[PDB]
Amino acid sequence: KKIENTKSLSSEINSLQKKWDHKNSQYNRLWQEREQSQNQIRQHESGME
Amino acid sequence: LTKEVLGQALISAKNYRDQLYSFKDLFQKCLFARKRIEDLTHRLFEMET
Amino acid sequence: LTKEVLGQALISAKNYRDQLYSFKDLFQKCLFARKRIEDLTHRLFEMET
C-alpha cells in the first residue's frame, strides 16, 4: 500500500516537473521576444532620426 | 519662380511626402513595439507567479 | 483624353493614393489586433486544459 502511494506520488512529481520545465522554456522564449522588441524600438528610433 | 527652381522645389516636396510617410510608418512600428513590450512584461510576471 | 476628364482622373488617382495609405494603416492595426486575439485564444485554451 505504501509503495502504491509512492508510485502515485512519483508519477505526479514527473508530471509536475514536465509542466514546470515547459513553462520555464516558454518564459525564456517570451523574455527573448521582449528584448527583441526593445531592440526593434531602438532601431526604429535611429531610422526616424 | 524659374522653371528649374520651381521644378526642383516640387520634386523635393514629393520626396518629402515620401519620407514623411515612411517616418509615420516607423512611428506606428514603435507604437506597436511599445505595446507588445508592455504585454510581454506583464505576461512574464504572471508566468513567474 | 480631354482636359477636364484627365484633370478629374488625376485628382482621383491622388485621392486613391492617400486612401491607400490610410487603408494600409488600418490593415496593420487589424494585423496586430488579430495576433492579440490569437495569443488570447491560445492562453484561454491552456487555461481550459
Side-chain angles (χ1 to χ4, degrees):
Chain A
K1 278 277 164 288
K2 304 305 185 287
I3 288 161
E4 291 157 5
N5 299 341
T6 55
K7 286 171 170 186
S8 192
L9 292 171
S10 298
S11 65
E12 297 157 61
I13 283 162
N14 284 347
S15 186
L16 294 162
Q17 174 78 34
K18 182 175 181 285
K19 286 161 67 78
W20 198 99
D21 291 337
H22 156 252
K23 289 282 180 172
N24 187 48
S25 80
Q26 298 195 160
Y27 168 83
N28 298 342
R29 202 204 76 223
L30 286 157
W31 200 63
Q32 295 152 10
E33 289 185 56
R34 197 202 69 179
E35 289 301 318
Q36 186 184 16
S37 306
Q38 297 142 242
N39 286 340
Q40 286 163 229
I41 281 185
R42 274 183 282 275
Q43 293 174 2
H44 299 327
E45 286 184 347
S46 191
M48 319 144 40
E49 187 169 40
Chain B
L1 316 178
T2 80
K3 291 293 299 295
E4 308 87 353
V5 173
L6 289 171
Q8 181 67 20
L10 171 60
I11 289 162
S12 300
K14 293 175 178 183
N15 298 347
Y16 172 94
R17 185 173 176 206
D18 287 347
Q19 265 43 240
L20 178 56
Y21 267 122
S22 307
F23 179 93
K24 179 187 169 191
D25 193 343
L26 287 192
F27 165 80
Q28 200 266 21
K29 298 292 190 181
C30 288
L31 171 70
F32 273 135
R34 298 157 183 182
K35 287 194 183 184
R36 197 170 195 259
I37 287 160
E38 170 190 337
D39 309 346
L40 288 172
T41 301
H42 90 288
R43 179 69 200 95
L44 291 155
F45 154 82
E46 295 160 0
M47 258 201 158
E48 288 161 358
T49 309
Chain C
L1 314 177
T2 183
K3 182 187 181 89
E4 295 94 321
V5 174
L6 292 206
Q8 198 70 1
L10 182 65
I11 290 161
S12 307
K14 167 146 93 175
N15 272 357
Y16 187 109
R17 112 186 300 163
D18 281 340
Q19 298 252 26
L20 183 69
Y21 273 120
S22 309
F23 164 100
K24 160 175 174 184
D25 272 9
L26 286 202
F27 166 81
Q28 288 185 335
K29 287 182 184 181
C30 287
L31 176 75
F32 163 93
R34 282 161 188 141
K35 289 193 172 189
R36 269 282 196 78
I37 287 170
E38 179 171 18
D39 278 346
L40 290 176
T41 309
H42 207 290
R43 288 195 73 179
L44 278 163
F45 164 110
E46 298 163 58
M47 262 195 168
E48 186 154 296
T49 309

